[model samples]
Target: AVGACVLCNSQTSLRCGACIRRPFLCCKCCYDHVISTSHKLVLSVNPYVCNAPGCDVTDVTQLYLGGMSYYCKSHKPPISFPLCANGQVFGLYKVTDFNAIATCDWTNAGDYILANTCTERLKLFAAETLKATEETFKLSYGIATVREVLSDRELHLSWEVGKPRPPLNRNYVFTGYQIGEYTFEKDAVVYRGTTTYKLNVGDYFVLTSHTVMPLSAPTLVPQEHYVRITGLYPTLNISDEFSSNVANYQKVGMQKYSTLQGPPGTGKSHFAIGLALYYPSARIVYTACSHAAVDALCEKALKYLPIDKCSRIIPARARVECFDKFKVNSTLEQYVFCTVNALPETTADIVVFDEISMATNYDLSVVNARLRAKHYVYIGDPAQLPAPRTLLTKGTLEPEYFNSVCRLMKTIGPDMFLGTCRRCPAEIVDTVSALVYDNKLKAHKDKSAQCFKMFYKGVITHDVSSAINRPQIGVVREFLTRNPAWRKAVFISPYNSQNAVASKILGLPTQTVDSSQGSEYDYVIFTQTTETAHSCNVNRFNVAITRAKVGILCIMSDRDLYDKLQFTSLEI
Candidate 1:
């Protein structure tokens, strides 16, 4: 299929057959297009099929690249792999090969009828499969044995030659014990794993299935709301109509499904509060991606709404310290406060789900299906952190790996995009506006001068901590010593590994920029761990700079790192 590449105008063998363009693309352009556009390409190899025995079903079967296996509920493979990872699988191991090895206790027990003594030791040349070798090397205890030695041990020690080795520290139940003399031996037993275990005369085991109940069927969306949710409406530009007044939000809310977007410090949360109050007679379900966002919404609502009307639902599993001040509601009340997962099993007159950009497709689906609303309004900044991608496995295509619902909302376009940052100083706001939000985000004029003077005297500062290609940490220490006020400042790192190091050295708790979402501080210190372009991810970097209400310090390897970021430096 040699053809001209539609993307880069080069020669190529690959093309997107599903797309209308059927664009021929070279390897680099093919991958780039797949990543950026989520287009499926026609591959040279045959289509992958479900490997389940006797199951020829093949459509839409997901392949787990970790184990190189294919399985889905539609086809139902013999062994089901997890959607992500850390999944469990169990199988019986029959000992057909006597040459295989096992550790044995040479000491004899009183069990003559079984004709097996458990004692053997013999090492042989290694001819194990890579899978077998990997599994064997992980054994905490084991011994290799020849045929004669294994048979002799089995006769005297009651040790079976062909039983599987079950997982350690796992529970199993034994039943139907035969009444043998002085020993309760088993002729028939139903167990989870086929592994043999030496049970003492007195040992207890319990078997109980902790089955997880499926979520209730999602309430159906009405046609009007579904139309807007699916982005059927022409791109609405209601930006000019917005102000401090509730009338604008009320008008936006009447659209059944709408979007409110802005960068950080844009007072979207305040807008949510005002919108909720606009409908006094209506029951509202206000939610966000995490407890911090939910807590923020609840706090703002509490100031105006009655205490009885606003209830915060915190999951029992959530950290106690995080929500110690807010009363956790086990019973869902009107004007319900909760994260996306903790939403109550009830519909709402209006559903104001915040942090649209942070929520995953699965998260939004759960919210949309479980709590159908008369009016559903989403609010978040696309320039800030999008939903975190947890599917770290390889070989999967673009759309599965990029899990954020923000892309879809962005395509639909915002019904209203608030462009002013009320909390940030002009210097910080202008920098972010140009770099991240296409020069659209602005600083509120009222507080720009005062906030700039109080928090940052002159300009945002950057520290270059490297010399002649060697990185140094003394810069961070010196900066901290000079400004003792920064000791209490929250440290933000893009990588968690950096978070660990920064927290240890700074003697203060540190968080990755992802975890620091929905949080603000008087001051912030961002640790730029690397000098490469990879470190300056726009979404995360946008969040790192905007988290500080007063001041932010960037600690990096070199000012040359700014070539990737391309911002002028100003010393304070």
Candidate 2:
């Protein structure tokens, strides 16, 4: 049937059967839409999207089943019976052939097992299905999905005769690294002549389940049986009359010393910024332990800081319009203030130490002396990572910075806890609280399965040199990379070496478990050690796990290591 393109309504090429799919879309539209998704087509993340003008489709399921001839009811086939390249006679049999090569039922496309007969049948079917030559189709394990091979011996991989992805030869898990380049493995094959982006370098093994790394469920989902709620105050321009919490936080600075406890995603940062804005006439100073926190504060400051006041005091590398002058201060001493003549002031009326938990005892020591403010509100999460600790003995890695925090908190007076968490899903909040209360939260929930506790069920051994297991690292990266913005997920490891390696694999910055203090993320991947009595301490676990606003993944090489944390056992 030939008719107008479903999208542009133009009478020409490009089509997909409306009756075949929900929210029916053209071939190209479907393909482009599916690329952003991780599940659906598990085997081939890269699908042959029709390059017809605007019709790039990831799924041609109807086309595959109906010989690509199936289209809108009003459409008619013109020159070719089926619209596949090479223009061969097409029919429903193509889908059967596709299943023989790929998978059926929109399931885990790669997981096929039973007997050698299945492999043999697949091979015979592959020969008849693909129009290309024997050398034309092949798949290899490179960076992303090389399952298992002895480090000392030849890297064994499973490959089939198939079309090659373009710009593809060797893919690497690590930068500048390529698999299948060397090591004498005899029974191996590679396909050539298909087009795919090489930058994905590690996708062959990254195919994920729909359940893997799911986006966290919202706490107050408006639809269905959910507890619906919204953010207040600075988060929503909420009036003080509407909420006492925001109003209290706004007025809390009057205390000589006030410590504010913020759980992940409770609009804690916004509350802090509100406190700054609440006091218009007062001289305010804001400083945080990390550059990201400083930048976040400045972003929010400019968003609500009575205009030019933000210009008076801008930390370096802030928003282009966040401030008048961005001073080049890199560390957490990292002060933001303004003088009378648009100049810098030595002190302020209110000093807010953001991410106070992440503060090195040294940063606190410096702030304790430097922060000559009349009222001080220290904001941080004690549950998250604190100062660094030795991996071996679980001792304070840095003495001075560690001791500094011990001293400052003792001098604090009135404290306030931010109960409402606007940042994370309710499941994340519950999971974080599970750190203190065991079995309070379960793995199976009717509402949300966002926070997953995965054990060492997959085959991957830890590295003796570093705590990380290389193969498992691929699996975790695969899990996190299920989304296009996998880089946004934070990988918190106790050791710098492991953190750096994990960071390198994902091509994203990583934080040592201790350094992860005060930072929040949509996803937190924590590498649990095999040792029972290692650094799964309260401080480390609290800091790293709480970083996630979506959910936290507790990845461990051993069960005892996870159990020893005394946290609830919810690993599925």
Candidate 3:
């Protein structure tokens, strides 16, 4: 094998193992040619060569790709090896199958080590972190035997002692982009070792443990109106029926916590407003589940009390333009309006929660956890629709958990039922009272103006049978189109899906029975979407039909539903 070198013509023992003719090179030429050409050089016995057979790429820079591997780009197999640098551990990956370059930064955040991948063109791979425990880990690969060495670029290990740096042994496969196509063949250990983690932005299945934090008890503040209410009792000018409950309403305002059950149109808002007006110095946080409920009480406050005396505290997250007229900057106002969800940040002397039937125990607990008031006025028609989230069953409210604060507090606190209705006409009141309230409620006066007196007809029923309630929606659309001047008309339904379709198409305030609470209109178009008896229960039906001040137009998809719901014999 001794011959003159091709480059320097020097006699030497080294021969080119890969190239034909087997040219020889001296030690000096061999060293220079390795740096310049990188072709394979052979000795008498063994030679440094490419890992791939029949291929002669011996360029140290090309072979390693700045890594410790014997194969070139074409034959580089799936490989993962641990490394450490700058007080942090990392994993370098090179998989020829994917043409992938990945780096796993094994940084421990508390109890997890995050794994990531670096790939060719820097775009093929995405990384994720996972939090793992010993119980979640299954055997994936044998123990890795590593040998560390420092390079100019970073600290990495070579395949000095192990089987070519063990590849990821089938943990997770991730989809990645090839040159111009898609592939999901990349295999990487996304979760392994002690408390493994991944740092990525993707859909994740998060496992969590429960943590309980006790709420601070409601604080006690002096009852300002507890004494002043007695003096203002004489100024009340309500009907004798309503006035009979006035003393109890005033007493409930003075007590620690009380329920004032005002059936539909029963002057609950008026009683709440009188409390604020008669006791101007009393700080009150008037709240409800819906902004419309808070706004109804606030509208009355603005009419009597000076604008400066009332402030609507709308949440920053809530849409404010709807209540912009009521909104004010005065935190010192005697009356404040806010929804129950926005009450945790504020408190008052008397926290009057209106439309209380619409609130669940969870919603009440949210208010109970933060807001502090001396006399809590829980006011609403217990016969009105419950919170829409309630699970309808054979006996839904029999379990104490399903009860709203309005229903539960009637027995828990000093309760007073406002049995008079002044918001609706005599005929309308008689129908609702007989069906829902056992004919106990009395209609005092029709506070509606002379214009509404023309629609003297109480309940006008229209029966229709259409797929998806087309006739019901069509009837409402045509009525509003023809009677645009008859403003304050709303189309209400028992289901949200029906209301959404009507609202989207008809360009009117189409709302569900749940959302229509604490709201009223001169004329109401009630649409019963389903034949299910629960859709037209006493509470929901009463709230739906009673929303009309002048009259109601019932659009029934099922005649049986109207009979079961609207008749004197109401099915729950």
Candidate 4:
């Protein structure tokens, strides 16, 4: 296989195993690879086009089209003169007396290398054409990830947030002309507001309107106005209110190992507390990844320990590392305790793991093995960022741990989950669901205006790229300035320091998207994302982007690239 195949350049289905580097091959290439009779080749991976540019596996994929790979059934060539081996369609033209050539030829000799080579015919054009795409994502106001996509011969699309409920499943009927059996001229695609019916631009009339309202500057407010939202909801005192979680707690009585799973803002903490209080007779060991988390739980449990029946009978409660932080002292032989340290050599009836997502895979292995318990419950959102990676070499310590959400879920398989997010607006929640979960969450704004904003600009061809629209910073700064209640917003960035939305405007509460996991601010801003160097994985995006509560905004460059990522569907 001299590249594509000895026959010609195209996708392949066979390869030479004898060759140290097994190259890709197809039908024609397969024939030529063993043509010498002295050599042999083996059938390689699937060569059929998946039609889906986004799917991981391409062959025989759901989106496949007729006799061609990459092209979806929904989008096909009108007439078969054989679409160029390249991604583009080409045609022949007669010039002068008899000689003719391809409109956009990608063939060199006989084999076609038709990818980016058919350059000139592109015809895409726009104002902020690249910039305009920023507004499309409901989550942030930044644009990231840009590719040229041959705008001159095709579309250089920029997606701005359309009204709520955009047609996510929509496809269209595009008619190409061979009018009078003639040569090329008009070519384009059209879309409808809803995926329900194919859009007929002529039959449908698009109504347009505009609102003159504008975003105003922030006016400073007293400190008390912007206080942090603390603890569980005032209504959280009643644990039995949530049926799913309450029923799951019954399993703990049976001494069954299980998990108390829930997403951010689901009050997983309070539910776990319900178990600790529900059965005070049981000895317990509660472990968290941090001192602050344990302290908060200890403080909350204090409220329960004093209940009037006089029998909240906990032997004791205290932190393993910061012993002073817990309510009860480590002196108790049988008691509930909190700690960020390794599991102690002790036995208990119940084991409660909180912020379990923050524990490392290694830490969990050590904890599960070292600690003793009959009934166990693990609580945390696996969708949230997991513990950061670490070597665990003897004494090394890092805040984030290497998460093992997938692995732990297998043994517990607990059905307990919290449904309501009392923190952010519905729009932000919907955005998170859309990113992690497969379906579109219909957004109902809790605020007067839409909570999402995207500020996009970039070098679409760069391997990685980012940019910041400085003015948007002023817009946000002023908004926070005016509404102090929304001032608790945390401006996040991948860079250690952000220039556009520096501590000067937003204050020094900055943290890279990594450290801010499991915490949410009323507003989250990605001050900047730039350069080919900035990259992200699914785990980071899930935890990093969800930090916003009432509102969320990402000030990014080349934001369009977010669409390019292929993600598996969220299970819950």
lDDT of each: 0.50, 0.43, 0.51, 0.42
Model 3 TM-score, all chains together: 0.51
Candidate 3 residues lying further than 4 Å off, grouped into runs, are 1-214, 218-246, 319-322, 326-330, 344-347, 390-404, 409-414, 445-467, 474-488, 500-508, 557-561, 564-572
If candidate 4 were superposed on the true structure by all CA atoms, what would the RMSD be?
Answer: 25.9
Residue by residue across 46-106, what tens digits does model 2's lDDT show? 2323334445343443223223433321233454333332322121222222232332221
lDDT of 1 by residue, 486-571 (tens): 78888776554455455566776676777777788877777666643335566677787778776666765434334333223434
* Model 2 RMSD vs true structure: 26.7
How do the residues 399-499 of candidate 4 rate in per-residue lDDT, one tens digit apiece?
12123333344344434656556665665555566665443223333642325455444223211122333454555575566557656667776543243
* Candidate 1 local lDDT, residue 377: 75
* C-alpha lDDT of candidate 1 relative to the true structure: 0.50
377-495: candidate 3 lDDT, tens digit per residue: 77876677665321122333311222344435444532677787877766567767877677888988653331121111123232322114555666666666666754466878776
Q: Which residues of candidate 4, in runs, are more than 4 Å off?
A: 1-244, 306-325, 328-335, 340-342, 390-405, 408-414, 438-450, 457-486, 499-501, 531-535, 558-572
Find the 10 residues in a row with the least total lDDT in model 3: 178-187
Cα lDDT, model 4, residue 352:
74
As for TM-score, the candidate ahead, 1 or 3, is 1
Ranking by TM-score: 1, 3, 4, 2
By the TM-score metric, which is better: model 1 or model 2? 1
Each prediction's number of clashing residue pairs: 11, 32, 11, 48
Candidate 1 lDDT score at position 125: 10
* Weakest ten-residue segment in model 1 by summed lDDT: 119-128
TM-score of each: 0.54, 0.45, 0.51, 0.46
Worst 10 residues of 4 by lDDT: 92-101
